[PDB]
Amino acid sequence: SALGKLQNVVNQNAQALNTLVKQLSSNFGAISSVLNDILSRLDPPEAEV
């Protein structure tokens, strides 16, 4: 338990990176969370919406 100072930096960096990566699976209000599916299911005028 002597080296908590150096472990905290690694933990913070890893957790921030993990949160940033996990933020990709969110709708944010859209119908689906993957844009490949969006482009292959609707016409452009609402696909862009």
Shortest CB 37 distance to another protein, Å: 19
Shortest CB 39 distance to another protein, Å: 14
Q: Which two tokens stand for residue 47?
A: 């696909």
Is position 45 an interface residue for another protein (rule: CB under 8 A)?
A: yes
- The DSSP result for 1-49, as a single string, is -TTHHHHHHHHHHHHHHHHHHHTTS--TTSS-S-HHHHHTTS-HHHH--
Residues 15-44 that bind another protein (CB under 8 A): 43-44
Residues that bind another protein (CB under 8 A): 43-45
